[PDB]
Amino acid sequence: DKKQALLEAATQAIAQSGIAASTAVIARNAGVAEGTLFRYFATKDELINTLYLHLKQDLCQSMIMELDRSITDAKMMTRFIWNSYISWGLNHPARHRAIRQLAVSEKLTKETEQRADDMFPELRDLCHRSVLMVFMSDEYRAFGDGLFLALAETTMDFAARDPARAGEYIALGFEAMWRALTRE
Amino acid sequence: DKKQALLEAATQAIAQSGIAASTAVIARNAGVAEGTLFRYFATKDELINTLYLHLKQDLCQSMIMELDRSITDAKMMTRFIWNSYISWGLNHPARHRAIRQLAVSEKLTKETEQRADDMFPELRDLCHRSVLMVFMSDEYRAFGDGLFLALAETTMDFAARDPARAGEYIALGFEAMWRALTRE
Ligand SMILES: C[C@H](CCC(=O)O)[C@H]1CC[C@H]2[C@@H]3[C@H](O)C[C@@H]4C[C@H](O)CC[C@]4(C)[C@H]3C[C@H](O)[C@]12C
Ligand SMILES: C[C@H](CCC(=O)O)[C@H]1CC[C@H]2[C@@H]3[C@H](O)C[C@@H]4C[C@H](O)CC[C@]4(C)[C@H]3C[C@H](O)[C@]12C
């Protein structure tokens, strides 16, 4: 209720100003007292981690609905996932913009990354597994996520500005992403 | 003089606010009267095209200085070019941020793109030619430039935030770029 309202105004504020967004600004735009914000998130760090999970759950639920679990080929399954990402970001630009900033923030906790991997099993292995970014050492997975998000943002930009060619930008960006971030 | 001052304040303003940056804001920060700005650039469109050329000349002059023209291999020559881009953007973040916005703006004229290709011959063919983005139809070259810039920005971000691994981010981003934007 007030929580959904607070997460929504945090989304918009971080989309616009980054992890720096002020809590009072966020509380104001949710129409709650800043102290009430603190009852929901005592710290900027907690807010970042909860918002990330909230956004990531939203995204993954959208993927679950678009997904044809019969698909066996990893490239084709990866294309469908890319297409659902791109379309989620085009429908919800601030959600994409916020999650992009959260995903690279260094404030995400290992618990949070555990709750990320955990609570969508459907996505673990109705997709066999991986191929994407398997080739990178652990220390660079944040970087490989940053590259994926850079390519997806650019794809969305072009597709929003030139909708008559949206599908073409989507397929070219996918290929770029696939070539960049997978291996033999 | 006042022109260099005006281009410098346009760089900073577009870096911060996009092609939308106001001319009065720009004139103010250059410490000239807005009418004097109009003597240098009568239109926002002219300013965009002149600024782009100014930035692109700066970038290419930096590449000319780093370049070992003996290199024959296209991948190795392309790596050197990427490395000089990344380092130019890390040294001059607003220049990169402005040129990124200009490069995708749709206000760049064909004359301007002619003056782009023209006035750095050294770069045409002390590099044999191309490989990069040759596979795309003409209509998508702006998109392929957007992808290159997305990858380079991300690489710079990580390298500025984690300098002890700057070289590693640079080499991983390069490979991503090379795989995305070239073909067999
Ligand atoms: C679900 C899918 C794995 C499927 C596969 O390759 O078979 C994974 C691989 C890449 C992942 C994305 C990339 O890791 C980039 C982003 C990282 C952010 O932490 C979450 C959203 C984010 C956009 C990710 C969502 C999702 O977990 C993706 C899309
Ligand atoms: C000089 C080099 C061509 C060399 C080669 O592959 O052999 C080209 C190929 C890609 C070019 C870059 C990409 O086209 C992306 C950007 C496009 C902007 O219009 C200029 C800067 C920009 C960053 C370009 C500068 C320069 O002209 C590059 C780096």
Numbering used by the authors:
A (entry chain A), B (entry chain A): 8 to 191
Paper text:
To elucidate the recognition mechanism of cholic and chenodeoxycholic acids by RamR, we determined the individual crystal structures of RamR complexed to both of these compounds. Electron density maps of each co-crystal structure are shown in Fig. 2b and these structures were refined to resolutions of 2.0 and 1.8 Å for cholic and chenodeoxycholic acids, respectively. RamR binds two molecules of either cholic or chenodeoxycholic acid per dimer. The structural difference between cholic and chenodeoxycholic acid lies in the presence or absence of a 12-hydroxyl group, which in turn results in a difference in the electron density maps of RamR bound to these compounds (indicated by red arrows). Comparison of the ligated structures with unligated RamR revealed that the binding of cholic or chenodeoxycholic acid triggers uncoiling of the α7b and α8a helices, suggesting that RamR recognizes these compounds via an induced-fit mechanism. Instead of a π–π interaction, both bile acids form four hydrogen bonds with the Tyr59, Thr85, Ser137 and Asp152 residues of RamR. The KD values obtained from SPR data for chenodeoxycholic and cholic acids were 65.3 µM and 60.5 µM, respectively. RamR protein solution was passed over the DNA fragment immobilized on a sensor chip while in the presence or absence of cholic or chenodeoxycholic acid (up to 500 µM). Both bile acids inhibited the binding of RamR to the DNA, in a concentration-dependent manner. The IC50 values of cholic and chenodeoxycholic acids derived from the SPR data were 33.0 µM and 19.2 µM, respectively.
